[PDB]
Amino acid sequence: LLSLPLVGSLPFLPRHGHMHNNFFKLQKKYGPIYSVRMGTKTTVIVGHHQLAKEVLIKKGKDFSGRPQMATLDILSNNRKGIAFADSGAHWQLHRRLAMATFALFKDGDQKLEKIICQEISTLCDMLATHNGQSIDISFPVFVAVTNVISLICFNTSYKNGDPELNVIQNYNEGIIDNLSKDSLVDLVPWLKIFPNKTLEKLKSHVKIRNDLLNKILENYKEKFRSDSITNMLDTLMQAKMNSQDSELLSDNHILTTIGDIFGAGVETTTSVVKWTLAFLLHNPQVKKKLYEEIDQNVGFSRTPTISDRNRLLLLEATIREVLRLRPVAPMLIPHKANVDSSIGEFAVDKGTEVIINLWALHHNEKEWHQPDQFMPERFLNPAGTQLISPSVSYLPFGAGPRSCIGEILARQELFLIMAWLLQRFDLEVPDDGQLPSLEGIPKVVFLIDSFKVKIKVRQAWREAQA
Numbered sequence: 159l160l161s162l163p164l165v166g167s168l169p170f171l172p173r174h175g176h177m178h179n180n181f182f183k184l185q186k187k188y189g190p191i192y193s194v195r196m197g198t199k200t201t202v203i204v205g206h207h208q209l210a211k212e213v214l215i216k217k218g219k220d221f222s223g224r225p226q227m228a229t230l231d232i233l234s235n236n237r238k239g240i241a242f243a244d245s246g247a248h249w250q251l252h253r254r255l256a257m258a259t260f261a262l263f264k265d266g267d268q269k270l271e272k273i274i275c276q277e278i279s280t281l282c283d284m285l286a287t288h289n290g291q292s293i294d295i296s297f298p299v300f301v302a303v304t305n306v307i308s309l310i311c312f313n314t315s316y317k318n319g320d321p322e323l324n325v326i327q328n329y330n331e332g333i334i335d336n337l338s339k340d341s342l343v344d345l346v347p348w349l350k351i352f353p354n355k356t357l358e359k360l361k362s363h364v365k366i367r368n369d370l371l372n373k374i375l376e377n378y379k380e381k382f383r384s385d386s387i388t389n390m391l392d393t394l395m396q397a398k399m400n401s402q403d404s405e406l407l408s409d410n411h412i413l414t415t416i417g418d419i420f421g422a423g424v425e426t427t428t429s430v431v432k433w434t435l436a437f438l439l440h441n442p443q444v445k446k447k448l449y450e451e452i453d454q455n456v457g458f459s460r461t462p463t464i465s466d467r468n469r470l471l472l473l474e475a476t477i478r479e480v481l482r483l484r485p486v487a488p489m490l491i492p493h494k495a496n497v498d499s500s501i502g503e504f505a506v507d508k509g510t511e512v513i514i515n516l517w518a519l520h521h522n523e524k525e526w527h528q529p530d531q532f533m534p535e536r537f538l539n540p541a542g543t544q545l546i547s548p549s550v551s552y553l554p555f556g557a558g559p560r561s562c563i564g565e566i567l568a569r570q571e572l573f574l575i576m577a578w579l580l581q582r583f584d585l586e587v588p589d590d591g592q593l594p595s596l597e598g599i600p601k602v603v604f605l606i607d608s609f610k611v612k613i614k615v616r617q618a619w620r621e622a623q624a
């Protein structure tokens with residue numbers, strides 16, 4: 159009796175469980191590195207830190223490419239910008255100019271910390287009006303960090319009530335939902351198989367956003383002067399008139415770059431805040447210690463500041479643990495091999511998509527103790543007097559040529575938002591008992607479901623205004 163001809167095989171069910179976890183589970187069978195092939199395209203999936211650091215760092219320039227996706231073509235305006243641009247002149251030029259801009263905010267009246275604390279103070283104010291109510295803090299936060307990024311890009315911010323923020327949130331939500339059903343890593347290229355309106359939807363959202371950007375671009379071409387270089391949009395225009403590069407800095411090129419900066423800045427950081435609050439509602443004991451800690455080292459004589467990250471250690475560990483358990487990009491962004499190269503002595507041909515399963519790196523049992531648990535203690539020494547790095551299998555922000563450019567902005571924004579929130583507010587479970595689900599919704603960003611927090615102004619903050 160004969161066996162059936164097999165026209166295709168896949169190692170697990172599509173749309174069943176989270177991709178990053180499904181790949182992780184296969185390592186029991188196949189090893190920390192393996193490949194899958196769809197049609198003519200081969201994809202490799204790496205899930206151990208050693209091989210990862212080889213793809214990211216050691217042979218970084220070999221694997222610094224981005225694969226083309228129908229859905230990303232639209233968002234990045236045909237692989238422009240930074241995040242979704244192939245490695246090349248365009249990419250390298252803009253990446254450095256972006257990174258350069260963060261130097262203009264290292265001191266002065268535009269010290270990044272001052273720009274941040276300003277919008278947080280607007281934030282805490284707004285929230286305080288909801289004293290004794292249960293609310294979704296997504297949009298109050300979205301607004302705060304949008305303002306920070308807008309100040310970095312244009313030296314401007316939005317006024318409270320401005321409906322442009324709403325327009326932005328709508329297309330932000332729409333781009334994310336249509337960018338991919340789930341993770342960016344798709345096994346089967348569904349959208350090319352069945353009739354669907356996925357691309358039409360994404361175009362019409364991204365059109366709105368590109369309109370809004372182009373509008374800002376025009377109403378800044380007049381306000382620009384080489385005598386004043388203070389923000390990201392200045393930096394890009396400075397470098398354009400000095401030009402071989404006149405093509406690499408067209409309108410569409412600066413548009414799309416500002417695009418990635420705006421998106422990355424707001425969505426990643428707002429997601430992580432939410433994940434942070436969510437975890438603390440599940441773990442009161444930790445929350446108590448964070449309250450206890452903040453009262454000892456900052457009290458109520460003043461508002462928190464960067465310099466406090468040197469003493470508010472448990473808060474720092476907490477943020478570190480949230481980024482461990484729930485990475486923003488559980489599988490980073492997909493990489494590509496620019497040349498023929500190797501990983502763990504295995505040949506990898508030019509054009510091969512390479513995927514780093516960061517989920518596997520943060521949940522590896524040999525590297526972490528009880529990795530499935532939320533234990534910020536893991537990032538502190540046994541006394542709790544300094545921070546540690548208990549594993550090298552940890553890469554929230556990536557590494558090497560395509561690593562995160564806004565890590566420093568992000569780490570600060572997060573630290574300040576929580577510290578302020580913790581100083582001023584009692585954050586509790588809403589009256590009907592519902593906690594949020596820490597299962598999460600993997601899209602291009604690892605989101606959490608909407609949820610509510612009952613929010614009260616702490617007595618100790620009130621009884622210290624007299």
Ligand code: HEM
Pocket residue numbers: 240241242243253418419420422423424426427430481485486487490491492554555556557559560561562563564565567568
């Ligand atoms: C907690 C917050 C954040 C996390 C965990 C994070 C993490 C990451 C990761 C994993 C990547 C891709 C790594 C790779 O492809 O190898 C990335 C890329 C990038 N991130 Fe972030 N990020 C965060 C916040 C931000 C912020 C605040 C900005 C502000 C501008 C930003 C801008 C970018 C850009 C432009 C890239 C593309 C890099 C490239 O293609 O060369 N991100 N980030």
Ligand SMILES: CC(=O)[C@H]1CC[C@H]2[C@@H]3CCC4=CC(=O)CC[C@]4(C)[C@H]3CC[C@]12C
Pocket residue numbers: 241329330333334417418419420421422425426486487490491602603
């Ligand atoms: C963490 C990360 O990789 C960042 C780098 C580029 C960022 C994205 C590119 C710009 C962008 C625009 C949007 O309208 C939704 C948010 C997105 C889709 C951004 C979400 C987070 C990304 C994917």
